[PDB]
Amino acid sequence: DVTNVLLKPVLTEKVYFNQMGETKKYVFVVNPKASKTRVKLAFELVYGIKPLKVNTLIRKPTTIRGGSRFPGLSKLEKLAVITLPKGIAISV
Amino acid sequence: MKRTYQPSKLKRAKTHGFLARMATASGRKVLKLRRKKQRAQLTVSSE
Amino acid sequence: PIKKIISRSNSGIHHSTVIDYKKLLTTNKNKPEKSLLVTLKKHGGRNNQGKITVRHQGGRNKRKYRIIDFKRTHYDNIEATVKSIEYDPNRSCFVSLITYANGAKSYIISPDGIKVGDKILASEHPIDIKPGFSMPLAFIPEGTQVHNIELHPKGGGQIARSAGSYARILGQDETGKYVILQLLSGETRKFLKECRATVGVVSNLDHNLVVIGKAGRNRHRGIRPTVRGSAMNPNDHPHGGGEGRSPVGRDAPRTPWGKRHMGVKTRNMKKASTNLIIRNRKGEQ
Amino acid sequence: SYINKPGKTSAWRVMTVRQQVSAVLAYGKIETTLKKAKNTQKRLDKLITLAKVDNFNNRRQVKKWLLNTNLFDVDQLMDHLFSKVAPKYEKTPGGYSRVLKLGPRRGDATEMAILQLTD
RNA sequence: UGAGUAACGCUUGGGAGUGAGAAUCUCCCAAACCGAUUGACUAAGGUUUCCUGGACCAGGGUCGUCCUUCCAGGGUUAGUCUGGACCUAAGCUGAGGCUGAAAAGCGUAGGCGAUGGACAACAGGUUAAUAUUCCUGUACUUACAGUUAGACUGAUGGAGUGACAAAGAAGGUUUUCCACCCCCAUAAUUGGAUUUGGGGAUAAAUCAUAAGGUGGUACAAUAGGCAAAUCCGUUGUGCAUAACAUUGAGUGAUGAUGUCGAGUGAAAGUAGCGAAGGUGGUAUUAAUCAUGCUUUCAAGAAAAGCUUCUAGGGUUAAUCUAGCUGUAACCAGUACCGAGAACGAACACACGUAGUCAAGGAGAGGAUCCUAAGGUUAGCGAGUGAACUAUAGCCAAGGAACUCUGCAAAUUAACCCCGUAAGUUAGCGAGAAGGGGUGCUUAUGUAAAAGUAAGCCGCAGUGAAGAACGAGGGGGGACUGUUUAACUAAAACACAACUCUAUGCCAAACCGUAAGGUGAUGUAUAUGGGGUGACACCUGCCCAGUGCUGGAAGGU
RNA sequence: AUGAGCAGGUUGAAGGUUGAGUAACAUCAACUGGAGGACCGAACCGACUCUCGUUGAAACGAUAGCGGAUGACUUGUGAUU
């Protein structure tokens, strides 16, 4: 835990749909430079509470701005979704 | 009914990949002249 | 012994024959060992660089070369018993299973006249002269059958070790060495009288009367069908060139290379080994 | 020519005519082209003339010129027809329908015509 | 410019609605379709094309209110699966070293490199996207540190195993199928009705049974496996009844108080609801047994890895098993298209490309028609029925007269019943040639049925679909075979074989200049080179010149 | 080097087992046998005539058929020349 990998949480449509349920699946955007164990224990250290289960994927770099004179590329970032025991909820 | 070009990224990684590309000094002089010719694209990693 | 093959096909006939495989051979279903079998790789008629060096090679199935005691001096003075005679597709002759009494196995090349269950001794001392024995060349009377002779001291028998091969003894030389021996194919030379050999003549007289019968069997042996020399263009082959079924029109033609091969012996004579030869399949020296 | 559309073939024409007469019996008004309306008028007049007697045999033949839609069933259609609509036109000789040609279709400037029916 | 011009890139219609504006946008009804695919899984690939809302600048064979088009937002979850942390085969790199003007090449120790070996999770669920990946149920697995319970474990080296061809046939097992039965909806109005149609599943995993299958088993030592051995192996004694070692379908209980289940069902055909949830079989079928057995020769991978012997050591224990507890299982990967409206395609080019499932009826078949689930209108349409073009249906008679031409084009192929000549090198010919008949109903049929008899219809019964046209003779080639991308598919090539020559190991020859290597991980019954090229009889003459070799005297 | 696959109907060779039989043979008869650079015939491999067409859908396709269709097997993955 270098205290520089956990950037921010995200809030989207599917994120809202998963959070209105009891999944307790808090979602965050991070640098993909850390492993699943590394990210889960980093969250533990930065919050003092061990997470239940962590799933990880990446935001695939896609072309941005579509077809124009100056096309670009979307950034790469790891999306980490964590589960928690139903009895507790964390404060963001 | 199949043209001469068959796309496959892994075989490309072995063929035109940099780590395999260090097989002969000809490749370094060619890429050196490419750099002198200001080619923005020099590798498959930078498409 | 060979047996004619009933073609049984509706497209012509076949003029091939087949080895007995039933009376002179046991356990046709291949159930060999593990330790001394190593896959004999085929180069496909190519060098170690991948360039072309040999013509019409390739098409055989997988074959395992058998680790065979060619020197026959690895273990000596120990009695053994022949256990079986097994086919060797990797060589002209067929291998044989013998068991040493110390608790070790052995694979040799066996001559004719041997069956399953015979006692064989390997030693560096004058022992039985009947074929198959391994015994130095200092204790055999002349005018006998012997094969698998090496020329180097402890070099391993590699000459006249094909099916139906042997050598003759024609006296010694006044040097304590250079025993005169009639080589195979009519040659005659002088080798060391202290080397090792396998007495008798090699078995499987059949190869002089074997007919492949079909092109496909020839491919499966390894010798792929190949194009004649005259069939190419004049830029590629000397025989090749000209149209209208033109025969050769020059005296003593060359190879595809610049080499003339007819009527000329391809060897160097300046070696001292040349002066150690007795006959050249034609006459003295 | 080689492989192409089937085009105007007698089978396609008769199936289209049967489907259109089924539709006009279902709804009572259909918009088609005059080049189809011309022969569908004869076909429908023959259908009306064929089964005004309202017998079982009449249903037996007319079960071979009707199709189905998304609003009613063929059984309901034939029942209602034989009950009240089929014998309606037994008063005047012919002229049971009119094809009034409307504006051309926007797609290819092809003529459109609506069909109405009364004695 | 040609010119408003050929084509409009393999296929519909209707209703209603949205939209100012409709064949082209949407919802649905039909039709004819792919259906050993117009279906699904799906390696690999392109990579956001995937999904929602707005819109149609540009692209879409008219148009496009739309598109998979653009804009904004959203989308891919892995202790158990695929590729890493285990491993290698071809092959590749390669400490050093060798060769080699440099350069560079060779290649040692080594290290990489699955289409593979070992190898721990299945089902159901919902979504606008995926979910051996998110949730529930049910489980299993590995090391970790302590633990008590049992014990001396045995590797770095060795050995067994891993570890393997192809082809063929029959056995066991659930299966498929059939009838019966249960359950579900279910009495028809147009003549007769005194109904038809559908369904009848449950697993991972644990325990026991394991049908069956393979190959010695117990005892004593040895001179072999750098060292050593109890392990492998050698020779001996006992029994060969199978003792013995060994695996194994499927079966029974959980699992399964459950899901599920056609259907029923509130503005969605959705929540909810939901009946039955089996009997004997097989003379048809697939796979477990099955690295099974046998047969044929073309003789049929290694490494990792499990057991494992001594080594090595252990002892107030090294090591290791069982149980319990706690910890944790990291890497890339997951969208769809996916033999293609997403790959190659110069394209929304009528095309084709890894593997897998793969219906029914007729038939042996998966040959051919139809339809099953699913999916579909191949992004120009509407017309009329001129010439001519493209394809077909029809053609009588002469019936190859056409033309170099049976090029092109018509009976012919399925079923069974007969029967088939010469030649033959006894393989074939031969499905020769040449013919008979094939439908239904009634009875009989046997294991199903073929088959027979009686009757009947038509002009005729592979009733529409799919099925060979021959004989006689010649030239060559025996034949099965390779063919010039795409002008030309063979009497040319190849070919078994015959023949000659050369090659005795640092082999001859071959690759470079060279190490070195092929040759060859070969050993004259083998290989190379030259000629001919089923089978049989032979291949006559001259070494004139030339060539090749040998040679000894002798002029150069 | 490592592999995938080649439906269905098939045909029914030698070997061998046995018997008659012969002094031994030989010969014949019954049987297992599933082999055949074996058949029809598929998926498949490729095209032999004509045809459409040759600013074509086509910088070589499609069709009427066609030769092969257990073997000189089609072909894949990676590498080599």
From Swiss-Prot, chain A:
Subunit: Part of the 50S ribosomal subunit. Contacts protein L29, and trigger factor when it is bound to the ribosome.
Name used for this protein in its record: Large ribosomal subunit protein uL23
Source domain of life: Bacteria
Location of this fragment in the whole protein: 2 to 93 of 237
Source organism per UniProt: Mycoplasma pneumoniae (strain ATCC 29342 / M129 / Subtype 1) (Mycoplasmoides pneumoniae)
Chain's role: One of the early assembly proteins it binds 23S rRNA. One of the proteins that surrounds the polypeptide exit tunnel on the outside of the ribosome. Forms the main docking site for trigger factor binding to the ribosome.
Family statement drawn from the similarity comment of this UniProt entry: Belongs to the universal ribosomal protein uL23 family.
Large ribosomal subunit protein uL23: region residues: 1-92
UniProtKB/Swiss-Prot annotation, chain B:
Keywords on record: Ribonucleoprotein, Ribosomal protein
The keyword Transmembrane belongs to this UniProt entry's keyword annotation: no
UniProt GO BP: translation
Pfam family, one: Ribosomal_L34
An annotated Gene Ontology molecular function: structural constituent of ribosome
GO annotation, cellular component aspect: ribonucleoprotein complex; ribosome
NCBIfam families membership: rpmH_bact (TIGR01030)
HAMAP family for the chain: Ribosomal_bL34 (MF_00391)
Family statement: Belongs to the bacterial ribosomal protein bL34 family.
UniProt-listed PANTHER family: LARGE RIBOSOMAL SUBUNIT PROTEIN BL34M, MITOCHONDRIAL RIBOSOMAL PROTEIN 34 FAMILY MEMBER
Name of the molecule in the record: Large ribosomal subunit protein bL34
Taxonomic source organism: Mycoplasma pneumoniae (strain ATCC 29342 / M129 / Subtype 1) (Mycoplasmoides pneumoniae)
Swiss-Prot record, chain C:
Protein name in the entry: Large ribosomal subunit protein uL2
Binding partners and assembly: Part of the 50S ribosomal subunit. Forms a bridge to the 30S subunit in the 70S ribosome.
Family: Belongs to the universal ribosomal protein uL2 family.
Gene name of the record: rplB
Pfam families with a match to the protein in the record: Ribosomal_L2 (PF00181), Ribosomal_L2_C (PF03947)
Chain's role: One of the primary rRNA binding proteins. Required for association of the 30S and 50S subunits to form the 70S ribosome, for tRNA binding and peptide bond formation. It has been suggested to have peptidyltransferase activity; this is somewhat controversial. Makes several contacts with the 16S rRNA in the 70S ribosome.
SMART domains attached to this UniProt entry: Ribosomal_L2 (SM01383), Ribosomal_L2_C (SM01382)
InterPro entries registered for this protein in UniProt: NA-bd_OB-fold, Rib_uL2_dom2, Ribosomal_uL2, Ribosomal_uL2_bac/org-type, Ribosomal_uL2_C, Ribosomal_uL2_CS, Ribosomal_uL2_dom3, Ribosomal_uL2_RNA-bd_dom
Ranges annotated as spanning the membrane: none
GO cellular component terms given for this protein: large ribosomal subunit
Keyword RNA-binding among UniProt keywords: yes
Region (Disordered) residue spans: 221-265
From Swiss-Prot, chain D:
Domain of life: Bacteria
SUPFAM superfamilies with a match to the protein in the record: Prokaryotic ribosomal protein L17 (SSF64263)
Swiss-Prot/TrEMBL keywords: Ribonucleoprotein, Ribosomal protein
Ribosomal protein listed as a keyword: yes
GO biological process, one term: translation
MF (Gene Ontology): structural constituent of ribosome
Name of the featured protein: Large ribosomal subunit protein bL17
Gene: rplQ
